[PDB]
Amino acid sequence: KIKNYQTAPFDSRFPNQNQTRNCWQNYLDFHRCEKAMTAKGGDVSVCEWYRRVYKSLCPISWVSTWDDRRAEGTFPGKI
Amino acid sequence: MAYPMQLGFQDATSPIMEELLHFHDHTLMIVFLISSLVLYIISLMLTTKLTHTSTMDAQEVETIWTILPAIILILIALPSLRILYMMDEINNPSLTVKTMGHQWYWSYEYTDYEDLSFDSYMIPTSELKPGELRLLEVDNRVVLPMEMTIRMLVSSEDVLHSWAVPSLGLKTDAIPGRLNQTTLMSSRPGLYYGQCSEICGSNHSFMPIVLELVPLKYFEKWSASML
Amino acid sequence: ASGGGVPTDEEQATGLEREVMLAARKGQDPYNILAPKATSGTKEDPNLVPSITNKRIVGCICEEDNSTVIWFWLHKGEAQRCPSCGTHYKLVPHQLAH
Amino acid sequence: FENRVAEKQKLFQEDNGLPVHLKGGATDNILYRVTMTLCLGGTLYSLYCLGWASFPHK
Amino acid sequence: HQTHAYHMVNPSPWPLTGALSALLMTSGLTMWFHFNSMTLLMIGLTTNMLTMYQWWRDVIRESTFQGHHTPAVQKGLRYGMILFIISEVLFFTGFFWAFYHSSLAPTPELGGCWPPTGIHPLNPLEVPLLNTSVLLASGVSITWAHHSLMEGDRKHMLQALFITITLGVYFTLLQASEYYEAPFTISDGVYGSTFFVATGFHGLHVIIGSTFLIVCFFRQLKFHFTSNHHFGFEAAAWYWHFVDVVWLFLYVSIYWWGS
Amino acid sequence: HYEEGPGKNIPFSVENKWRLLAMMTLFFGSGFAAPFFIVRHQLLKK
Amino acid sequence: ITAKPAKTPTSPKEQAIGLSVTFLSFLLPAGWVLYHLDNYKKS
Amino acid sequence: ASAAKGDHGGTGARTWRFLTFGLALPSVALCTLNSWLHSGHRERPAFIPYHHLRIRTKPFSWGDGNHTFFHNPRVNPLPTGYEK
Amino acid sequence: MFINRWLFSTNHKDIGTLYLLFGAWAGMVGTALSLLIRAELGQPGTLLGDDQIYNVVVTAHAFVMIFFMVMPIMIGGFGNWLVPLMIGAPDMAFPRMNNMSFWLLPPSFLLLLASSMVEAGAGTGWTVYPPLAGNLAHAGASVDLTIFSLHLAGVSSILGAINFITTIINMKPPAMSQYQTPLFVWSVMITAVLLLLSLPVLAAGITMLLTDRNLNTTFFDPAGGGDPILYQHLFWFFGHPEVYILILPGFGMISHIVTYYSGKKEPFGYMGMVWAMMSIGFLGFIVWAHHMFTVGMDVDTRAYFTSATMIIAIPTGVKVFSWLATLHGGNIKWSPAMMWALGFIFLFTVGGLTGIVLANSSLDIVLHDTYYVVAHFHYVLSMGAVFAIMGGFVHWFPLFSGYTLNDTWAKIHFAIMFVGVNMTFFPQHFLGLSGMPRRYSDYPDAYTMWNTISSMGSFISLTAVMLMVFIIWEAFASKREVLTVDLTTTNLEWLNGCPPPYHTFEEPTYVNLK
Numbered sequence A: 001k002i003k004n005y006q007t008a009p010f011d012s013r014f015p016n017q018n019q020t021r022n023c024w025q026n027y028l029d030f031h032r033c034e035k036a037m038t039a040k041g042g043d044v045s046v047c048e049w050y051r052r053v054y055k056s057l058c059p060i061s062w063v064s065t066w067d068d069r070r071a072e073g074t075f076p077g078k079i
Numbered sequence B: 001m002a003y004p005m006q007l008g009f010q011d012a013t014s015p016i017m018e019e020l021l022h023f024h025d026h027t028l029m030i031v032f033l034i035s036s037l038v039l040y041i042i043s044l045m046l047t048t049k050l051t052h053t054s055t056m057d058a059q060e061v062e063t064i065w066t067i068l069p070a071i072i073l074i075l076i077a078l079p080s081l082r083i084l085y086m087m088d089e090i091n092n093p094s095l096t097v098k099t100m101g102h103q104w105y106w107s108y109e110y111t112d113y114e115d116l117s118f119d120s121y122m123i124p125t126s127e128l129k130p131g132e133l134r135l136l137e138v139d140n141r142v143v144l145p146m147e148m149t150i151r152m153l154v155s156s157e158d159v160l161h162s163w164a165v166p167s168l169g170l171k172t173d174a175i176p177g178r179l180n181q182t183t184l185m186s187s188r189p190g191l192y193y194g195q196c197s198e199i200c201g202s203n204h205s206f207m208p209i210v211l212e213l214v215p216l217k218y219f220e221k222w223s224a225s226m227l
Numbered sequence C: 001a002s003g004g005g006v007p008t009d010e011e012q013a014t015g016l017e018r019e020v021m022l023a024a025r026k027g028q029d030p031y032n033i034l035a036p037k038a039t040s041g042t043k044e045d046p047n048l049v050p051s052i053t054n055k056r057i058v059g060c061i062c063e064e065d066n067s068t069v070i071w072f073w074l075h076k077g078e079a080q081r082c083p084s085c086g087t088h089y090k091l092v093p094h095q096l097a098h
Numbered sequence D: 001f002e003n004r005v006a007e008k009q010k011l012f013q014e015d016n017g018l019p020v021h022l023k024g025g026a027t028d029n030i031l032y033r034v035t036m037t038l039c040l041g042g043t044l045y046s047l048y049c050l051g052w053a054s055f056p057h058k
Numbered sequence E: 001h002q003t004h005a006y007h008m009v010n011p012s013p014w015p016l017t018g019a020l021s022a023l024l025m026t027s028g029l030t031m032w033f034h035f036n037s038m039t040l041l042m043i044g045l046t047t048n049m050l051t052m053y054q055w056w057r058d059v060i061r062e063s064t065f066q067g068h069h070t071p072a073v074q075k076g077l078r079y080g081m082i083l084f085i086i087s088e089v090l091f092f093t094g095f096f097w098a099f100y101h102s103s104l105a106p107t108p109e110l111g112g113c114w115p116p117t118g119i120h121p122l123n124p125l126e127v128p129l130l131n132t133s134v135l136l137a138s139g140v141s142i143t144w145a146h147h148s149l150m151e152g153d154r155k156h157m158l159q160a161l162f163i164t165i166t167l168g169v170y171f172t173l174l175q176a177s178e179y180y181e182a183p184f185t186i187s188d189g190v191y192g193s194t195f196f197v198a199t200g201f202h203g204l205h206v207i208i209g210s211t212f213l214i215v216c217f218f219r220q221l222k223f224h225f226t227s228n229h230h231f232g233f234e235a236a237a238w239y240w241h242f243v244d245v246v247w248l249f250l251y252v253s254i255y256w257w258g259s
Numbered sequence F: 001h002y003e004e005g006p007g008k009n010i011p012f013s014v015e016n017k018w019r020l021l022a023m024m025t026l027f028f029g030s031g032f033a034a035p036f037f038i039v040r041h042q043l044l045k046k
Numbered sequence G: 001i002t003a004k005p006a007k008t009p010t011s012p013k014e015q016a017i018g019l020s021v022t023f024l025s026f027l028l029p030a031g032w033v034l035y036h037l038d039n040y041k042k043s
Numbered sequence H: 001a002s003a004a005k006g007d008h009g010g011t012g013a014r015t016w017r018f019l020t021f022g023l024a025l026p027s028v029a030l031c032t033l034n035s036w037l038h039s040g041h042r043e044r045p046a047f048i049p050y051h052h053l054r055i056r057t058k059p060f061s062w063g064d065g066n067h068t069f070f071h072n073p074r075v076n077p078l079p080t081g082y083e084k
Numbered sequence I: 001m002f003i004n005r006w007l008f009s010t011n012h013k014d015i016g017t018l019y020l021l022f023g024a025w026a027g028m029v030g031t032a033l034s035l036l037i038r039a040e041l042g043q044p045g046t047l048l049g050d051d052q053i054y055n056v057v058v059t060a061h062a063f064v065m066i067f068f069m070v071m072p073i074m075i076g077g078f079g080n081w082l083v084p085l086m087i088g089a090p091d092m093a094f095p096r097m098n099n100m101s102f103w104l105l106p107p108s109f110l111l112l113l114a115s116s117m118v119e120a121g122a123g124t125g126w127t128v129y130p131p132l133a134g135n136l137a138h139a140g141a142s143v144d145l146t147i148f149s150l151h152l153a154g155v156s157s158i159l160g161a162i163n164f165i166t167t168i169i170n171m172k173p174p175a176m177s178q179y180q181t182p183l184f185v186w187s188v189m190i191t192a193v194l195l196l197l198s199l200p201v202l203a204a205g206i207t208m209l210l211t212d213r214n215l216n217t218t219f220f221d222p223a224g225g226g227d228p229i230l231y232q233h234l235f236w237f238f239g240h241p242e243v244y245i246l247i248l249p250g251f252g253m254i255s256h257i258v259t260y261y262s263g264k265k266e267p268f269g270y271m272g273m274v275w276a277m278m279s280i281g282f283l284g285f286i287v288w289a290h291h292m293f294t295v296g297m298d299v300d301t302r303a304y305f306t307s308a309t310m311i312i313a314i315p316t317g318v319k320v321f322s323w324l325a326t327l328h329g330g331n332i333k334w335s336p337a338m339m340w341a342l343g344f345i346f347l348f349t350v351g352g353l354t355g356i357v358l359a360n361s362s363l364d365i366v367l368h369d370t371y372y373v374v375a376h377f378h379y380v381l382s383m384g385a386v387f388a389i390m391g392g393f394v395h396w397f398p399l400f401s402g403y404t405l406n407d408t409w410a411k412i413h414f415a416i417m418f419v420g421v422n423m424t425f426f427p428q429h430f431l432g433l434s435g436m437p438r439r440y441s442d443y444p445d446a447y448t449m450w451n452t453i454s455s456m457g458s459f460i461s462l463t464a465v466m467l468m469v470f471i472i473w474e475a476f477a478s479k480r481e482v483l484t485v486d487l488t489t490t491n492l493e494w495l496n497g498c499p500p501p502y503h504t505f506e507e508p509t510y511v512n513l514k
């Protein structure tokens, strides 16, 4: 719905060679949205865009390490 | 790839690399001119019995050899900067692929739709198949669709490395904890080689990069079969 | 608020420091701290170059603002001329330390 | 305290041909030998350590 | 006999003992970090202290006792000190660069914010502010000491110099307690790294400067300084001001802005 | 002071050209040989 | 520049000797190590 | 700026002493008051094994290799948490 | 007396001599390392069979050539010997501290040789970038001993800088302004200022690497929020000024040699020469990131660094053309020193021009970390510095020793070296353009031809170095004492005889104010 995604589009907020924050921001956004939805009684499907973008941009080991830390309670980012 | 006795750049595979060839031709002409001129004048100053050892005035000829060089530098900078910004232009890719450097091999990840990933190691010289290139072949190549704008994201999981493909005009350092972006676009199908370009220890010389450019349709079946 | 107890150079300076100080007071420069002023440098009015031996290296800045300094040994005896501008210099030897 | 600089000036300007680092007397000589012995000995010891560290102790 | 005012120094063994002590300290640090032994380091630090003591003792002998410091020699020593201080400024600049580089673009590993997640900075209005008033005050008192010396007032020179030193020691003690009380350590990421290495090197400079002042204090007690010739004191004062200014930058950058 | 003049302002002797040849040969030869022996050292440790 | 004749002239024979000795001091040690490179690689 | 005081007719030893005792030391006294007032041990925060903190890539060259140089048991947790 | 003179020295000439001896010895070490590099690359395959050893060899080659050969010779050797003589000063401002700048080098060299002896050496590249240089990829004492070597070499040079700047500012005749000092003296002062400002930043940076390796700091470790790129900035902030530090005293000696053998009383456009060196010095501090065009920097930053870097060609051009204008109309003396200077002018210009090709970030993407860079710096730095050193050495050897060299042998030496270095390095441009990476122990088969020729060229240069040693021996063996020297009126350093007495200028020169 409103998707049909090929890959993460150009984001004017991150126009330079260093894309580290682009990955990080979308990872955060997806998880913040996922928590809002699961909490207030709504659907995680609205959080889809962020999931696709961070999935396309973020290295597997980063996503993996971050997931592990959120589970351990050591994720330094605010979610 | 480079061939025996090559003098200049590998043949341009992308529009940007073509652009650089022309810019290099332009600049190299200038380099030849100035170096030969200097060599010339040296020989000119040394081939005469005529002398003039008294004090010579400088605030006049110094204007010439200050303004001319400045103009020549601007003549180089203009096309240099035009290409630099052109490389930077927003292109909007159809695909995103990531590569992680490791001691000593590269791994690739195509995670736009499916979670596809694999390691890419150099084929040992003893295991090369007849006709294959020593130090250049890898077990798993980087299959990519030709004639499409692709976003390459480069990083590392240990020390620094550098992902390069001379034919496409590419070189982006692989730094741990950082995600470097570059765009790739091959005008032709084929196999394009590159080698790790940042000293990463013992096997820095042995962790090549091999891109395999095929039509989109073949890229898609390859991705499926690679899951 | 105030008082004394701190020695002065006059009372405590010693060695070469003291010599330079006492000489400067008499308006002398035995240790070549100052740049000598030129005479007209003619045959009759040569630049007098003090020395404690029978020769001293002279550096001549022929014209004001020249970056090139002309160097040569000035020997005791008849006045010599700068190889570049011809101005005259004459050595006036010995003494300093009584 | 009293100003005894003049005494020290006399002692160090005394024409005995001794270099400034030994001109204070026998203590200078001792301190010097201690310093130099520690330096030279310590250096020999470092060379030894280098020899030791140069080889693998598996 | 020479007829210029410069100083030809007697052949000295200190440059060699100094160089060797440098080898002993670096070798020692290596032996300590990797081969768990402090023997070399111990000898190194010892010969180093011995070298500095004898070398500067000789400089005092050459100037106060032998009179080799004519105005020309003193002029050169002034340039030497200013240049030395400049090199020290550039050294600190490298650490301030490291601080600003990390703090201005906090990486995801820190939580993408500064200070990092999990770091609770010291309150800059507490001991760090006290430390600031302490160094600023010592800057005033050392200026009083200098004017006293030049006006020929022995008692007040010693009084002002003593106050300056006490303040330097007070700063050092306060900082040492701050180091102990701090909830973060040098191993607490880039925050602890920049904090302790930068303030640490500064702390070392305060200790060096204090020592230099103490040396001037004793030389003053022994009447070495005249109301006009006292370069050792002037250099210690310039060095002390340098230390004071580095603190102001540290305070503003690391303690205040970086909190 | 010290001896002055040609062959006297240097830390080595040039009184005998053959002893000098030996000195120079050891001096420069040791420097040039060092890397070869260090490489040999590193290959022989493992 | 002008100079006086050699106080201790070095004849052509003496020069061949000096040159030879010089070249050998560089070439022999290095050559030895290089020659025995295989003996080192695996031992 | 010009401060808020005045003198300047001749800055000498008396003036700098006036500043030492009339401004500088009193400032140190006030800051000493302020500090030895707002002190008091603040309740140490709950331990969380954050990966960017308590870094250990090589043991320290002292003690058991796991304690920082100026380790304070009360406020400095080890990689595994606060001590006994 | 021997120990007093040579271990406890406070004389600028004797200290200069210790530096020339140290530097010549270091050059032998640096040369052997370079032949080991080229032997490994001499034919396809592996020679050493241990690439960590190859990397350790490349790393040590650079440190030795830079810190132990070039700097000691140019600044400590020629600088100590010539600067006081050229301004009529009795010695350096701090003649005792000067001795410590010297004595810190042998320990520094020992620490470097130690790092290659212990563990598996530091196979990091002379840039020592982490994480490769960190305690995980390079565990053990090696990298730490390397860092300490640099600390001692850094202290030596910083103290030497303070000494030279003070001496040049404070010890000239009362009537001589800074605009009346020789160009070599200017080149040393400017070099000293760059050293003074740049070395402390390196010191800061390598100290941070040391603490990351041993005190659990994470300045360059992403896990603690650090950044490997920060080290690069700190290194290169020192690194670029360093390359200008390596060439400046060379520019100074070249000006003297060219002026001297053109039979001129002065170099053309003195003030333009001063201006050029100062501008090069200034600009040399704002172009460092051109060593980081591939690390992933903003495009605007890259455009700035490309531009700032190109501007250096202007002041550099004024020097080149001024040397040529000094030759113009001269009564040319084809001495061996003049040949080195002329070779310098040409080879330096070639290397400088390829540096301008590299300044373009666009092109650098493809040239970075390839042999094109190695070719660039071996022309400007290797040939440039070595040629200036050889020219100055042959020119001033009679002043330092009191003996003359055999000119014919010296000309033969120049010829062999000229062939050797061009055969060794010219083909490397081809290797770079075609894509061969630097720091490689082996290469794809296509690169075989140029690598073979390059390694052959390296042996030619070895022959030249061995011959140089023989030539120096012959000079000392024959003992042809100097009698007369031309142009002493504009070359003060020669005015006190060959060799000049222990103490020169006990009675200073007389210079009128007018």
Ligand SMILES: CCCCCCCCCCCCCCCCCC(=O)OCC(COC(=O)CCCCCCCCCCCCCCCCC)OC(=O)CCCCCCCCCCCCCCCCC
Pocket: B007, B008, B009, B028, B031, B032, B035, B036, B039, I350, I354, I422, I423, I426, I427, I429, I430, I433
């Ligand atoms: C040693 C190996 C030589 C191999 C030669 C080529 C074989 C070709 C086969 C067959 C040739 C024809 C078929 C292939 C054409 C390929 C065209 C190409 O893609 O084009 C680009 C290529 C090839 O460029 C060329 O088109 C080759 C140019 C060669 C210039 C040589 C000058 C040589 C001088 C002395 C001999 C060399 C050593 C000393 C060099 C001293 C410094 C120059 O790559 C370059 O850019 C290389 C050069 C890099 C920049 C150096 C700049 C300053 C150099 C010299 C100034 C001298 C001035 C005075 C005049 C010269 C005075 C001495």
Ligand code: HEA
Pocket: B034, B038, B068, B069, B070, B072, B073, I243, I244, I246, I247, I290, I291, I309, I310, I312, I313, I314, I316, I317, I318, I320, I348, I349, I350, I351, I352, I353, I355, I356, I358, I359, I360, I364, I367, I368, I369, I373, I376, I377, I380, I381, I382, I384, I385
């Ligand atoms: C003697 C030392 C020395 C000197 C003087 C220079 C001088 C210059 N260098 Fe070079 N350089 C090095 C030593 C030196 N370099 C080293 C050691 C490295 C590699 C380090 C490493 O990675 O290990 C390097 C690397 C290097 C790089 C990084 C390449 C890379 O890693 O990808 C760049 C980038 O711009 C560069 C540029 C230049 C430029 C523009 C000059 C300019 O200053 C040159 C100017 C001179 C001329 C241009 C010629 C004379 C001028 C004229 C005749 C006038 C007319 C000219 C024009 C109008 C163009 N250098």
Ligand code: HEA
Pocket: I020, I023, I024, I027, I028, I031, I034, I035, I037, I038, I058, I059, I061, I062, I065, I066, I069, I070, I073, I124, I125, I126, I127, I374, I378, I381, I382, I383, I385, I386, I389, I390, I393, I421, I424, I437, I438, I439, I440, I441, I458, I461, I462, I465
């Ligand atoms: C001053 C700097 C200097 C000098 C002179 C040299 C000289 C030489 N270098 Fe260089 N080299 C570097 C600095 C220098 N190099 C640096 C910085 C690197 C990069 C390291 C890295 O990547 O980390 C490098 C890397 C390097 C490589 C690339 C390695 C790789 O990428 O894997 C190669 C390859 O051929 C090479 C070869 C040589 C050769 C054959 C010589 C010489 O044989 C050429 C001929 C010169 C001489 C033989 C010197 C003679 C001098 C004397 C003996 C002094 C005499 C003294 C008196 C008279 C007082 N060097």
Ligand SMILES: CCCCC/C=C\C/C=C\C/C=C\C/C=C\CCCC(=O)O[C@H](COC(=O)CCCCCCCCCCCCCCCCC)COP(=O)(O)OCCN
Pocket: C001, C002, E163, E166, E167, E170, H021, H022, H023, H025, H026, H029, H032
């Ligand atoms: C545990 C913490 C550690 C503490 C800190 C560590 C180190 C500090 C070290 C030393 C300094 C302390 C005292 C110095 C002691 C004796 C000085 C002796 C000379 C003397 O008594 O000097 C007098 C003034 O000193 C005097 O009041 C002495 C002055 C004391 C000043 C500070 C007291 C403040 C009082 C309250 C005022 C605050 C109000 C603020 C107003 C606004 C400010 C602008 C002037 O006299 P005279 O007749 O002109 O001189 C004849 C020759 N001496």
Ligand SMILES: CCCCC/C=C\C/C=C\C/C=C\C/C=C\CCCC(=O)O[C@H](COC(=O)CCCCCCCCCCCCCCCCC)COP(=O)(O)OCCN
Pocket: E172, E175, E176, E179, E180, E181, E182, E183, E184, E185, E186, E187, E196, E197, E199, E200, E201, E203, E204, H068, H069, H070, H071, H072, H076, I151, I152, I154, I155, I203, I207, I210, I211, I215
């Ligand atoms: C009281 C304030 C004054 C500070 C200095 C006083 C004592 C420490 C000893 C030497 C310090 C000198 C310079 C600083 C070097 C490293 C930073 C040290 C700053 C410091 O002391 O920081 C401490 C760490 O100590 C540590 O590791 C320190 C470990 C001690 C070993 C020192 C390591 C030696 C490395 C020196 C490198 C030398 C290179 C310098 C080159 C100069 C130019 C060439 C902080 O304590 P912590 O427990 O982590 O947190 C406190 C939690 N309650």
Ligand SMILES: CCCCC/C=C\C/C=C\C/C=C\C/C=C\CCCC(=O)O[C@H](COC(=O)CCCCCCCCCCCCCCCCC)COP(=O)(O)OCCN
Pocket: E075, E078, E079, E082, E083, E085, E089, E092, E093, E096, E238, E241, E242, E243, E245, E246, E249, I165, I193, I282
């Ligand atoms: C965010 C960053 C964080 C880190 C910051 C950390 C700290 C901050 C910085 C600084 C503060 C520290 C201390 C300041 C206190 C005292 C310093 C001493 C100055 C002093 O008191 O200087 C006096 C006079 O000024 C003189 O020297 C004037 C003469 C100077 C001579 C030496 C300079 C020579 C060096 C090279 C020359 C430069 C050329 C300029 C032109 C270049 C154009 C590009 C002493 O006299 P003198 O030498 O005989 O000279 C005779 C001239 N009157």
Ligand SMILES: CCCCCC/C=C\CCCCCCCCCC(=O)O[C@H](COC(=O)CCCCCCCCCCCCCCC)COP(=O)(O)OC[C@@H](O)CO
Pocket: A016, A018, A020, A021, E089, E093, E097, E100, E101, E102, E104, E105, I298
């Ligand atoms: C000085 C007078 C000349 C004026 C010219 C200007 C030059 C330098 C001063 C400017 C410094 C402040 C600029 C900061 C603003 C940008 C904030 C920022 O964010 O910059 C940061 C680094 O700045 C940093 O440490 C900056 C750290 C400092 C580097 C500059 C080096 C010069 C220092 C030596 C000079 C000696 C002076 C002696 C002192 C008295 C990080 O870099 P980014 O690329 O953003 O990375 C983020 C990515 O995820 C997205 O791409």
Ligand SMILES: CCCCCC/C=C\CCCCCCCCCC(=O)O[C@H](COC(=O)CCCCCCCCCCCCCCC)COP(=O)(O)OC[C@@H](O)CO
Pocket: C012, C013, E056, E057, E059, E060, E063, E064, E069, E077, E207, E208, E209, E211, E212, E215, E224, E225, E226, E229, E230, E231, E232, E233, E235
């Ligand atoms: C636990 C403590 C140990 C820590 C290690 C360091 C310890 C102490 C360092 C303190 C430095 C003490 C220096 C004492 C110098 C005494 C000699 C002196 O001060 O000598 C003076 C000259 O100045 C001169 O050389 C000026 C000499 C300048 C020296 C200043 C150098 C500071 C040293 C810093 C070293 C570390 C660098 C930082 C590390 C990262 C003598 O001339 P005057 O004073 O005019 O006398 C003449 C009159 O009497 C005539 O009437």
Ligand SMILES: CCCCCC/C=C\CCCCCCCCCC(=O)O[C@H](COC(=O)CCCCCCCCCCCCCCC)COP(=O)(O)OC[C@@H](O)CO
Pocket: E007, E009, E018, E019, E021, E022, E025, E026, E048, E051, E052, E055, E058, E059, E062, E063, E068, E073, E077, E080, E081, E084, E087, E088, E091, I093, I094, I095, I096, I097, I098, I148, I151, I152, I155, I158, I162, I200, I203
């Ligand atoms: C990993 C650990 C690395 C450790 C490396 C340690 C290296 C060496 C350690 C031992 C060195 C200490 C020995 C004392 C040195 C004193 C030098 C000094 O005080 O030198 C003076 C000159 O410098 C002046 O003034 C002003 C300059 C004063 C310089 C003080 C020397 C301090 C040495 C440390 C420098 C660090 C560089 C700082 C930047 C990072 C005096 O000059 P002299 O020629 O002596 O005399 C001239 C006579 O006319 C005097 O009457």
Ligand SMILES: CCCCCCCCCCOC1O[C@H](CO)[C@@H](O[C@H]2O[C@@H](CO)[C@@H](O)[C@H](O)[C@@H]2O)[C@@H](O)[C@H]1O
Pocket: E038, H061, H062, H063, H064
């Ligand atoms: C550029 C200027 C800087 C030069 C380098 C600075 C030198 C710093 C010296 C640090 O040395 C020390 O090291 C120790 C480690 O060996 C300590 O002992 C300790 O370490 C132990 C050994 O395991 C324990 O037994 C103890 O509890 C104790 O804390 C210790 O007190 C301290 O003196």
Ligand SMILES: CCCCCCCCCCO[C@@H]1OC(CO)[C@@H](O[C@H]2O[C@@H](CO)[C@@H](O)[C@H](O)[C@@H]2O)[C@@H](O)[C@H]1O
Pocket: G027, G028, G029, G030, G031, G032, G034, G035, I035, I036, I039
């Ligand atoms: C990069 C710089 C290097 C330049 C190349 C060196 C040029 C050649 C130098 C000659 O050196 C040697 O020659 C040998 C062979 O000709 C060796 O002998 C060896 O080989 C033998 C004969 O094959 C034996 O007689 C002995 O046991 C032996 O060790 C070997 O010792 C060595 O000294």
Ligand SMILES: C[C@H](CCC(=O)O)[C@H]1CC[C@@H]2[C@H]3[C@H](O)C[C@@H]4C[C@@H](O)CC[C@]4(C)[C@@H]3C[C@@H](O)[C@@]21C
Pocket: C005, D001, D002, E154, E155, E156, E158, E159, E162, E221
């Ligand atoms: C004894 C001497 C007077 C002059 C002289 O020595 O003849 C006096 C005058 C001022 C000095 C003192 C100053 O008043 C400052 C200090 C104040 C005291 O609380 C402790 C000692 C103190 C550190 C000093 C000790 C004292 O012995 C000094 C050195």
Ligand SMILES: C[C@H](CCC(=O)O)[C@H]1CC[C@H]2[C@@H]3[C@H](O)C[C@@H]4C[C@H](O)CC[C@]4(C)[C@H]3C[C@H](O)[C@]12C
Pocket: B059, B060, B062, B063, B064, B066, I271, I272, I275, I318
């Ligand atoms: C004014 C100054 C010194 C002149 C003197 O006092 O002798 C001279 C020295 C070198 C000159 C510079 C150099 O000749 C290089 C440039 C040449 C151009 O003709 C003018 C600007 C230019 C940048 C010059 C400006 C100015 O005339 C300079 C800077």
Ligand code: CUA
Pocket: B101, B102, B104, B160, B161, B162, B196, B197, B198, B199, B200, B201, B203, B204, B205, B207
């Ligand atoms: Cu990976 Cu080089």
Ligand SMILES: [Cu+2]
Pocket: I239, I240, I243, I287, I288, I290, I291
């Ligand atoms: Cu550079």
Ligand SMILES: [Mg+2]
Pocket: B162, B197, B198, I294, I368, I369
């Ligand atoms: Mg690179």
